[PDB]
Amino acid sequence: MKLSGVELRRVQMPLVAPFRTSFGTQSVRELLLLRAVTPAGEGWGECVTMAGPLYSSEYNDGAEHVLRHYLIPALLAAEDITAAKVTPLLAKFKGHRMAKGALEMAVLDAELRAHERSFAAELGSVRDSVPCGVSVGIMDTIPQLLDVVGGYLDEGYVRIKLKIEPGWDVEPVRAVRERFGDDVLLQVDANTAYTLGDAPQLARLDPFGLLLIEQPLEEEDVLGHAELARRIQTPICLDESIVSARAAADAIKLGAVQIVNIKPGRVGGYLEARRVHDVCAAHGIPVWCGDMIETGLGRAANVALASLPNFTLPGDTSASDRYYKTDITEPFVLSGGHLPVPTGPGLGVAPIPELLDEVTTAKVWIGS
Amino acid sequence: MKLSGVELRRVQMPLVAPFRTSFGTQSVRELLLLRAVTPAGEGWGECVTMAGPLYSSEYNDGAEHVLRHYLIPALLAAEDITAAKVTPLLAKFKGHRMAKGALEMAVLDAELRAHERSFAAELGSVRDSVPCGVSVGIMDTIPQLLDVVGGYLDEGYVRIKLKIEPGWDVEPVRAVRERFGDDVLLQVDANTAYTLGDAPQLARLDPFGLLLIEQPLEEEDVLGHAELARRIQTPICLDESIVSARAAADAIKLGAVQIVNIKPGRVGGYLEARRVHDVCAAHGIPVWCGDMIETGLGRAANVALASLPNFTLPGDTSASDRYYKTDITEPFVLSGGHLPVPTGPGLGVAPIPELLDEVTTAKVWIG
Amino acid sequence: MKLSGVELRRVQMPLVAPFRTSFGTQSVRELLLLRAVTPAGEGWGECVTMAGPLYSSEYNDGAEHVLRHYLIPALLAAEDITAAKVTPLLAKFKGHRMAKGALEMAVLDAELRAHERSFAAELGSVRDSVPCGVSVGIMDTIPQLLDVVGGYLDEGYVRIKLKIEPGWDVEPVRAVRERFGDDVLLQVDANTAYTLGDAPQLARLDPFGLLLIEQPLEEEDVLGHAELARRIQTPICLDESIVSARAAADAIKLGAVQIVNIKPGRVGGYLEARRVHDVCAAHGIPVWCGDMIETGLGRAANVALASLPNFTLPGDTSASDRYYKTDITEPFVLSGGHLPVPTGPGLGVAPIPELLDEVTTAKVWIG
Amino acid sequence: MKLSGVELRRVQMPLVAPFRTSFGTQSVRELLLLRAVTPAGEGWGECVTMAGPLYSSEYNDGAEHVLRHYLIPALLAAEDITAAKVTPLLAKFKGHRMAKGALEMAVLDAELRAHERSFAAELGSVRDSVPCGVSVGIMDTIPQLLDVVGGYLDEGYVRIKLKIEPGWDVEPVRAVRERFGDDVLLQVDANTAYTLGDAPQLARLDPFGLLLIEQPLEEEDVLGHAELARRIQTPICLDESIVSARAAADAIKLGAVQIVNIKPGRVGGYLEARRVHDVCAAHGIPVWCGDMIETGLGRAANVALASLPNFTLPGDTSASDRYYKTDITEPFVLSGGHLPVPTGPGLGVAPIPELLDEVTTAKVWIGS
Numbered sequence A, D: 001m002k003l004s005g006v007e008l009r010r011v012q013m014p015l016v017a018p019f020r021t022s023f024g025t026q027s028v029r030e031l032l033l034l035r036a037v038t039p040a041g042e043g044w045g046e047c048v049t050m051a052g053p054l055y056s057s058e059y060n061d062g063a064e065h066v067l068r069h070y071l072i073p074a075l076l077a078a079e080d081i082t083a084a085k086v087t088p089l090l091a092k093f094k095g096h097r098m099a100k101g102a103l104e105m106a107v108l109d110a111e112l113r114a115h116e117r118s119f120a121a122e123l124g125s126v127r128d129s130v131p132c133g134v135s136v137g138i139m140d141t142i143p144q145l146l147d148v149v150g151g152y153l154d155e156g157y158v159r160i161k162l163k164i165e166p167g168w169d170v171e172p173v174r175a176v177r178e179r180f181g182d183d184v185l186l187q188v189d190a191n192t193a194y195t196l197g198d199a200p201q202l203a204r205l206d207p208f209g210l211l212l213i214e215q216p217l218e219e220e221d222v223l224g225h226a227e228l229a230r231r232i233q234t235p236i237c238l239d240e241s242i243v244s245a246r247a248a249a250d251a252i253k254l255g256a257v258q259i260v261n262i263k264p265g266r267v268g269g270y271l272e273a274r275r276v277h278d279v280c281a282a283h284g285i286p287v288w289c290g291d292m293i294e295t296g297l298g299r300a301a302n303v304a305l306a307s308l309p310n311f312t313l314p315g316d317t318s319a320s321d322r323y324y325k326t327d328i329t330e331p332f333v334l335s336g337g338h339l340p341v342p343t344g345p346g347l348g349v350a351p352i353p354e355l356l357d358e359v360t361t362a363k364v365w366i367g368s
Numbered sequence B, C: 001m002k003l004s005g006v007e008l009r010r011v012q013m014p015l016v017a018p019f020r021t022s023f024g025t026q027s028v029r030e031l032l033l034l035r036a037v038t039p040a041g042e043g044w045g046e047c048v049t050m051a052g053p054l055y056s057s058e059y060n061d062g063a064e065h066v067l068r069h070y071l072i073p074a075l076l077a078a079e080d081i082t083a084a085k086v087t088p089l090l091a092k093f094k095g096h097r098m099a100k101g102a103l104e105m106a107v108l109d110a111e112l113r114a115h116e117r118s119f120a121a122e123l124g125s126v127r128d129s130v131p132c133g134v135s136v137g138i139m140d141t142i143p144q145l146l147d148v149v150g151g152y153l154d155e156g157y158v159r160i161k162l163k164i165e166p167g168w169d170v171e172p173v174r175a176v177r178e179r180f181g182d183d184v185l186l187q188v189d190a191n192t193a194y195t196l197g198d199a200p201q202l203a204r205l206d207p208f209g210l211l212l213i214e215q216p217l218e219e220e221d222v223l224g225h226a227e228l229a230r231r232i233q234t235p236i237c238l239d240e241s242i243v244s245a246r247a248a249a250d251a252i253k254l255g256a257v258q259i260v261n262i263k264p265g266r267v268g269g270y271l272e273a274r275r276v277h278d279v280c281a282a283h284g285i286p287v288w289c290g291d292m293i294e295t296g297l298g299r300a301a302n303v304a305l306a307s308l309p310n311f312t313l314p315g316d317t318s319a320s321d322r323y324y325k326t327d328i329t330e331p332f333v334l335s336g337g338h339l340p341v342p343t344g345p346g347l348g349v350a351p352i353p354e355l356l357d358e359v360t361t362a363k364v365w366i367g
C-alpha cells in the first residue's frame, strides 16, 4: 500500500449546550479530519486536539503544521506502508501524539477497508454493544446541575461523571447523591486542577462512594498521585498522564493509578490504545474508554475499542446527540444504555458528503 | 464465521538427527494438526505438545482428548465465532493452553484467509525477514558438540543455544568459547534441570559472557529465579514459567526475568503471544521467538510473530532442514542468517497433500 | 513594567563544521530571537528550539506560532509584569517550555537592565569565570575523531564529551582513551538512542572511567534509567528527561540520575533553571550547564548560570568560535580553559546591529 | 561593594501582653539589629535570637559575640561582596545560622537598595498581599484563652495557632472548637515539648480537624517524627528541625513532615529560605511563613517572602500591634485579614530614628 496523499480538513461543529471543564468553557468544537488516499481506497482519521493548548500541549494549528511539514511527508516518502509501520516511520519526531494518532487512524481505516475488516475485529472485540456513561460539565448553580443529571439518567445513561475544580467539588457531589441516591454510578474528573496540598479537600469526597477521581493533579506528577492515593479513599484514575503503554506500566508499578482512562489520540493512536488495554489487563487494572467530543468517525472507532474485554467500567462514549444536533455520519443512538458496535469494513461509518461540506471551514491537500 | 467442523490428524516426522534435552532424547516428532472448516474455507492449526508430559503437563493424547470432548464442541455450539472470541468461549476449561492455542491458530488462519490478510499483518510485523539462531542438544562427547556447532555456524546461523544439565554445563560452554571465540552469540537452556542449591555451579558460567540462561529452575519457581539472579551474572530468561501475559508481568515485577522466550502454544495461542510481547516491551524486557520443532505451518506463524518490534534477540526458528529432510509445506530455507516472513493470506503456507498423507498416522472428523 | 510589544526575529547562522548527534547532522543553526520592549527599555531572549522536532517536541515554527498567538498576547493583556510573574501568567498553556523560557529571558533582561543588575547577580553567582568543556559529534572515521579531539584539547578545553549511538560507542571511547590517556575528563551523550535491552553494550563502557553517560534512554523512561544504573558502572546523567525542578526531584528519588545537565530553555527559563540547581544541591546531586548552540545572547546567560555554586563539573558552554565564525554579540573567547562571567546590566551583551541584520531572515512585531 | 563596617544595636521592646510557650513566658522582646554600611549605602538586618538558649542553642549575647569576633570581620576582609557570597565567605564557621542570617539580611538590603530593587522582587513575589494568621500562647485558664481567640477572630485574622504542652493540649483545642466551630482554621505548636511516648495523648487531637501539629518532638528527632506520623492523624509540621534546604529534603524523604514552617533566621537567611521554599515546592510540600516577634524590619522581609507561590497556608506574620504598641518602622496593619507586600527599594521600610533611639539600650561599631 502506498500513501498517495492526504486531504486535511478543518471542521467546526456547534455543541448543543456549552461544556465547561476546569480549563474553560467551549460552545463550539473545532477539529481536524484526515482523508488518506491510497491506490486501493480511502480512510478517515480524526484528531482530538482543541483550538488551544489547554488540555495538553497539542492544539489544532500545531497538529496541522506538524502533519503537513513532517508526518505526512514521512509517510508519503515510504515505499510500502501499513498501520503498524506508521510508528517506526514517525519515531524520529518527538511527541505530537494526537497528530500521529489521527494519521495512523486514517491509514488503518484505509488498510482495513481494503481487507473488508472492521476496527472491532482488528482490535479484538468480544461483544456487540457497550454500556455508556456521560460526562457533565461544571454549571453556575446546583439546581442546574441536578436538572442536567436527571435528564441524562432519564435517557438511560448508566453512569454519571462530574467535572470538578476548586470551589465545585464536594457540594455538587453531595447534592447529586442527595437527589439521586447511593446506587447511581458516580465519579469525578478534575482535569489537573488540584495539587497535593489539596489532599484534605479531596478527602472530603470519601463518604460519597465515588468510583474514582480522574486526574486530580498535573500530567507529569505521577509520584504525587501515588502520595495522594495514600491519603484519600476515592480510587485514582489517570487520563492526561497515560501517554503510552509504558507510561501506564510505570504509573501502575509506582502505585499511582487503580483505574485507567484510555483515549486513543492521547496515546498516539488505536494500536497503542490496544497495548494500553493489554498492559493494564495484565496487571489487573480496569480500563474505560475516554471521549474527546469526536464526530461519528472517532466515536465509531472508540465504540469498537470499548468492546475489548478489559473495558469493565462504562465509558464516556455518549450518543452523538449528547454533543451534536447533526453528526457528519449516521448518528450513534443510545439503546437501553448501550451503543452498538459498528459492523462494516474499517470504521463502519464514513462522512455524509453533504453534511461534511456544511461544517468544513477549509481544506488542503498534501501530496508528493 | 460459523465453524462447520475440525479435522484432527496425527502426524509423525522423523528428525534428521536425535535431539537430546535435560528431559530426554527424541528421534521422531509426533504432533497433532487441526484443519478447521468454515463455509468460507479452511484454516490450519498445529499443537506443540509432545508424546509424553516431559516438558509440561500437556501431551498429544491429552490434547486430542480435550479438543475432541470439550474445546471443539464448545466452538461448534457457538452462533458466531472469531479468533478473539475463542478465549472467552473456552475460558471455563482450566489450563490446556497448547490445545487451545492450536485451535485458535486454525480459526485465525481461516479468518485471515477470508480477508486476504497475512499473520504478519494481523500481528503487526515491522520487517520482512528475521535473524535465526539454532538450538543444539546435549551430546555424548565434547568433540561431537564442537563439530555440530561448527556446522551450524558454517550454515550462517547467527546465534548458538546449548542445552545443558547437571554434568554438562561449564565444560561444553568452556569448549565452545575456546574453539569458536568470544564474539559468537552464545546462550544455554536447562529446561528446569537445576535447583537454587546449584547456584554455585551456575555461577561458574559467569566468565563466558553468555547472553542468558534459559529456565534453570522449575516452571512454578518464580521467586527462586529472582533469588538465583542475585547470585549469578548470566541474565535469567524464562520459557516454561511464562504461561500468559499476566505471568510475564508478575515475573518481571518480582525480578525473576530479564529476557523472555515467547512460544505461542505455551501461552494459549498467537493472540496471547502478542500480548506477552507488548507487556514485555512496556517494561523494557526484550523477547525472542521460541521453537517446538514445528512443521512449516507453526514455523510460518512463528516467523511472522518474530518480526514484531520487541523481538530484538535472534530466535530459535531454524530452517526446516535443521529438523526435517522433507517438510509438509514449502520449506523454510536460511538466507544470510535470516528467514523470510511469509506474504500470502493466513499463514502464507499450507500442507502439500501428498507429503502430508505420507506422514499422517490417523485422522478424525469432529462435526 | 508594562510590556509594549515583542519583536520576533528568525536568524540563520552557519556552523564552522557540521555537527552530528544520534538524531542527525546539522550544518546551519536556525533560531528565534525575541526583543521585548517596555517603556524603560528593551531586553533580549533566545529560543533553543531547532528547525524540526528531533531533540524534543518543540521546534522553531511551532514556538513562533505559540508565542505569537498565545504567550505574547497573554503578557500584553497583563497590567503589571515581572519575570517571576511570567510563569503564572502563562501556566494555563500546557508545555511549550522552550518558548516560555525565551520569553521569560527577554522580560528578565529588560527588568534587570532597568535595575542595572547582571544575570549573574540575580541568579547568585559565586565566581567570575567558569571552566568549559566541549561536545564533539559523531564522525565518519576514528582518525577524524582523534584529530578533532586533539584540536580542542590544544585549545585548552578542560573536558571532552562524545556524542554516541548504536555502532559508535565503545570504539570511539576506546580510541580516545588510547590516544589521549586516562587523565582526560571524558563523558558520552546518546541523546536517547538506546533501550534497556542495550544494557550489555553500554556495560562495555565500564573500563573506560567515564564521568557519566548522558541520556542513554528516551525522555519519558525515568524508571528504565534507574534500572540501567543498576547494570552499568558509568554514572547516569539526564538532559531531555529533566523538564522541571519537580522532574529532577522525582528522578533523584527514583534512583534514575546521579548528575544533572541544566538547560534553561528546556526547563522553561532561567528562573526554573535556578530552582533545578537548588533542588539538585539539596539532594547532593552535582549539576553542569548544557548548551544548545546559542548565539552570544544565550551563551552569556548560560555562563552566568554556570557560575552558581553546585555547578561542580565543567559545562558545555564552549567559546563562540567552536560554532560560529562571527557571533552576533562580542564573542566569548576561551582563556586558560575558562570563560569570563559577564559584568554589565542584564545579559551583559547585546546584538551588534549590523551583524544581526546580516543573519536575520524575517521579523515581525507583536504589539 | 565593600562592607565598611557594621553598627550593631541591642534593642528592647515591651510586648502588649506576655507570650507563653512550652519553653516559658516572655513579656519583653530583646533583639539585635545590624546596620551594614557600604560606600553605596546602608542596609538593615535583624537577628531572631532571644535572650537565652531556650528555643535553639543561639541567643543574643552569643550571636553578638560571634558576629563581632568572626562573622563581621570575615566580611570586612573580603575584597568584593554580594549577598550570595556571604555564604561561602562564612562557611568555615560552623552553625550560628540566626547570626549569619541577620548579617546576610543587612548585606542584601544594602545591595538591593543600591539597585532600587525590593526584597519581594528579588525573592520572586507573585502577589501583593498575604493572608495572616496569629499565634496564641498558653493561658492560665480556658475562659481567658477563648476571649483572646475571639478577639483575634474579630480583628479578621484568618487562622488560629495555639501553643501547646503537656497539660494544655486536648482541652484547649476542644474548647476552641466548641466555642468557635469546625470551620475556623486551627493548628497547634508544641515547640518540642513531647516525646514519642506521648503519641497516645497526641492521637486524642485526631477528631478536631487540626491543619497540623507543629514540632511535637525535639529538633534532632527526625525519624521519631516519621514514626509519630504513622500513629496520629494530625499532619506533622516541622519548625526547629528545618535548619536548611538539605534538612527539608531529608525530612521529606524520610516521611517526617507534610507541611514546613519557613523562618529565615533559623535557616541562615532569606536566600536559604527561598531555597527551602523551592525544595519543598518540588516535592509537593506546602510551606508557610514563621514569625519570631520581629520589628517591622524582619516583618517587612517576611511579608515579602510569604508572597512567593508555594506559601499556600496562612503565616504567623501578624500586624505589628499584635506584639508592639509602637513599632520602630511604619507599622504593619491588617486589612481584610491581609498584610500588604512592601514596595520600595530593599526591605521597603527603615527605622524611624527617634523611635529606634528610644528602644536602643546599647550599640557598638565593628569596623576594620
Ligand SMILES: CC(=O)N[C@@H](Cc1ccc2ccccc2c1)C(=O)O
Pocket (backbone or CB within 6 Å): A019, A021, A026, A028, A029, A049, A050, A055, A135, A189, A191, A239, A290, A291, A292, A293, A316
Ligand atoms: C467527555 C470529557 O469530559 N472529555 C475530556 C475533556 C474535554 C472536554 C471538553 C472539550 C471541549 C472541546 C474539545 C475537547 C474537549 C475535551 C476529558 O475526559 O477530560
Ligand SMILES: CC(=O)N[C@@H](Cc1ccc2ccccc2c1)C(=O)O
Pocket (backbone or CB within 6 Å): B019, B021, B026, B028, B029, B049, B050, B055, B135, B189, B191, B239, B290, B291, B292, B293, B316
Ligand atoms: C528448539 C528447543 O530447544 N525447543 C524446546 C524444547 C523442545 C525440545 C525437544 C523436543 C523434541 C520433540 C518434541 C518437542 C520438543 C520441544 C525449548 O526451547 O525448550
Ligand SMILES: CC(=O)N[C@@H](Cc1ccc2ccccc2c1)C(=O)O
Pocket (backbone or CB within 6 Å): C019, C021, C026, C028, C029, C049, C050, C055, C135, C189, C191, C239, C290, C291, C292, C293, C316
Ligand atoms: C552541545 C550539545 O551537545 N548540545 C545538545 C544537542 C544539540 C545538538 C545539536 C544541535 C544542532 C543544531 C541545533 C540544536 C542542537 C542541539 C545536547 O547536549 O544534547
Ligand SMILES: CC(=O)N[C@@H](Cc1ccc2ccccc2c1)C(=O)O
Pocket (backbone or CB within 6 Å): D019, D021, D026, D028, D029, D049, D050, D055, D135, D189, D191, D239, D290, D291, D292, D293, D316
Ligand atoms: C509566633 C510564634 O509562635 N513564634 C515562635 C516562638 C517564639 C515565641 C516567643 C518568643 C518570645 C520572645 C522571642 C522569640 C520568641 C519566639 C514559634 O513559632 O515557635
Ligand SMILES: [Mg+2]
Pocket (backbone or CB within 6 Å): A189, A191, A214, A215, A239, A240, A261
Ligand atoms: Mg478526563
Ligand SMILES: [Mg+2]
Pocket (backbone or CB within 6 Å): B189, B191, B214, B215, B239, B240, B261
Ligand atoms: Mg526452552
Ligand SMILES: [Mg+2]
Pocket (backbone or CB within 6 Å): C189, C191, C214, C215, C239, C240, C261
Ligand atoms: Mg545532551
Ligand SMILES: [Mg+2]
Pocket (backbone or CB within 6 Å): D189, D191, D214, D215, D239, D240, D261
Ligand atoms: Mg513554631
